[PDB]
């Protein structure tokens, strides 16, 4: 017997906020918290795979995060490179399929190369699908699908009055996966900050003051339970 | 001096849920609570106009609410007709601009005629803009703008690679108003249920267990205060 999605929850998306505050609370630089955040990513991926969750989607770098300090942005990119190298073989051994959603053109060659290669090694895996939203925005996401449909119309392949919700739905990120059931946002802010707008239309939303680097299995189970009791 | 938006809040959207439960808690039929909901709409519109809020957007009938019982749907439509007649002259006297957002084609002539006429009487008003989301869906909203852009492309007026966020932004409902600052959802459910997906990208989200027919000025002030303290 397989672990049937802990509490009926197939797809969880998480806004991993509070890294900066967590480090500052300790007198440390912001990047120290992002490093602590990665252990927290490791912990969440593990919990999801072990509890039958079909897909876990993590908000790692927003399309608005480029306005941050150039030096903070650089260390983020290098940390992502470092997480890919340190975790990939284990993701493959664990039957996890790795997908990065967002505009990867803006990334440096090294990072782009790591992503392409990590996705190709795990492309045929059938366990948990782990989606890392990097340089991602919900509006950007809708627009990419809208462009795929605009093109089709310029190719006389489609009529403007044929376009409807389900068609656009077939063109936004993760449409081939189960819909998002639960969005958990750590850090205490009560907003969704351009995360999966289209996809979260009927998703449960859970907010915790717990900061991302402190988010653990118990906190994840808590969210899951809140979802199971969503009566 | 004018009342500067109570706590810096220009545009509030409200998911008016809990009518059914509120009536049932009292042994009454569901429609009794929707009738009580309308007094609650009156109370919220009043509070918004008196506290300098620029726009108030109310979720009154979702595009998913047609699957409800035919008889419940009919009384809803008639109640909307009844609210238009009972409130319009007062909205005009109060300098409120009335806009209905959603697909009004699905409404019966009488209701469509009331809407068109109520909007034309108040079209030039300059105080609070009151948007009633009726037969509205956030996805539907994005798609209507996407169609306006598809058409333009079939008319060789636009190239698929020209379409971007701000352009689509200029084609979704309420783009000429201040963005949505705060979404309040009464009734206790923690989801946004297809409400303003595109527009709520950076909006504060507030959830209360209070049921819609019981929502009052004190509850509205509470939400406003929570927003002012959104640090
Ligand atoms: C997912 C990213 C890029 C950052 C998450 O934490 P923050 O760096 O936003 O730090 P806080 O100030 O919000 O606490
Ligand atoms: C805005 C509409 C159409 C209904 C709001 O309350 P409900 O009728 O959903 O009643 P509840 O069961 O949710 O309590
Ligand atoms: Mg943050
Ligand atoms: Mg309801």
A127 annotated to a ligand binding site: no
Q: Are B63 and B136 in contact (CB under 8 A)?
A: yes
- What is the residue with the minimal CA distance to atom 4 of ligand 2? B17
CA B170 to chain centroid: 19
* Residue of A139, A154, A205 lying closest to B153 (CB–CB): A154
**Which neighbouring-strand residues pair with B12?**
B56, B182
Q: How far is CA A172 from CA A107, A145, A199, B160, in A?
A: 21, 5, 8, 16
Hey, is A183 helix, strand or coil?
Answer: strand
Q: Are B49 and B97 in contact (CB under 8 A)?
A: no
Distance CA A155, CA A30 (A): 48
Ligand 4 ion: residues within 5 Å (CB): B 17
Distance CA B49, CA B91 (A): 10
Residue B42: CB atoms within 10 A of its CB come to 14
Q: Closest ligand to B132 CA? A: 2
CA B161 to chain centroid: 33
Q: Are A75 and A33 in contact (CB under 8 A)?
A: no
Residue A228: CB atoms within 10 A of its CB come to 14
Could you tell me which of A193, A143, A3, A92 has the C-alpha nearest to residue B164?
A143
Could you tell me which of A205, A180, A204 has the C-alpha nearest to residue A190?
A205
- What's A212's DSSP letter? G
Q: Are A198 and B192 in contact (CB under 8 A)?
A: no
Question: What does the H/E/C string look like for chain B?
Answer: CCCCCCCCCCEEEEECCCHHHHHHCCCCCHHHHHHHHHHHHHHHHHHHHHCCCCEEEEEEEECCHHHCCHHHHHHHHHHHHHHHHHHHHHHHHCCCEEEEECCHHHCCHHHHHHHHHHHHHHCCCCCCEEEEEEEECHHHHHHHHHHHHHHHHHCCCCCCCCCCHHHHHCCCCCCCCCCCCEEEECCCCCCCCCCCCCCCCCCEEEECCCCHHHCCHHHHHHHHHHHHCCC
B193 annotated to a ligand binding site: yes
Ligand 2 geometric centre to CA of B22 (Å): 9
Residues 19-48 of B with CB under 8 A from A: none
Residue B184: CB atoms within 10 A of its CB come to 24
Helix or strand holding residue A46 (H, E): helix A30-50
Method: X-ray
CA B90 to chain centroid: 19
Domains by residue range for chain B, with CATH: 1-231 (3.40.1180.10)
Query: DSSP string covering A60-126, please?
Result: EEETTGGGS-HHHHHHHHHHHHHHHHHHHHHHHHTTPEEEEES-GGGS-HHHHHHHHHHHHHHTT--
Q: Are A66 and A22 in contact (CB under 8 A)?
A: no
Q: Are A213 and A33 in contact (CB under 8 A)?
A: yes
Ligand 4 geometric centre to CA of A180 (Å): 20
Distance CA A153, CA A171 (A): 14
Interface touch B230/A189, C-beta < 8 Å: yes
Distance CA A73, CA B206 (A): 31
Distance CA B48, CA B29 (A): 30
All residues at 6 or more sequence positions from B86 whose CB lies less than 8 Å from its CB, including other chains: none
């Amino acid at each position: 017997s397989e672990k049937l999605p802990a509490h009926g929850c197939r797809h969880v998306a998480i806004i991993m906020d509070g890294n900066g505050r967590w480090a500052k609370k300790q007198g440390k630089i912001r990047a120290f918290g992002h490093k602590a955040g990665a252990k927290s990513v490791r912990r969440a991926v593990s919990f999801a795979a072990n509890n039958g969750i079909e897909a876990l989607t993590l908000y790692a770098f927003s399309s608005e995060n480029w306005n941050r300090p150039a030096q903070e942005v650089s260390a983020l990119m290098e940390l992502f490179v470092w997480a890919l190298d340190s975790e990939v073989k284990s993701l493959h051994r664990h039957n996890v399929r790795l997908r990065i959603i967002g505009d990867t053109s803006r990334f440096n060659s090294r990072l782009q190369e790591r992503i392409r290669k990590s996705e190709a090694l795990t492309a045929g895996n059938t366990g948990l699908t782990l989606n890392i939203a990097a340089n991602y925005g919900g509006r950007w996401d809708i627009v990419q699908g809208v462009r795929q449909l605009a093109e089709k119309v310029q190719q006389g392949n489609l009529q403007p009055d044929q376009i409807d919700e389900e068609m656009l739905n077939q063109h936004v990120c993760m449409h081939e996966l189960a819909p998002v059931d639960l969005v958990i946002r750590t850090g205490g802010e009560h907003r969704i900050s351009n995360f999966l707008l289209w996809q979260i239309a009927y998703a449960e939303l859970y907010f915790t003051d717990v900061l991302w680097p402190d988010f653990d299995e118990q906190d994840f189970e808590g969210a899951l339970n809140a979802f199971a009791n969503r009566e």
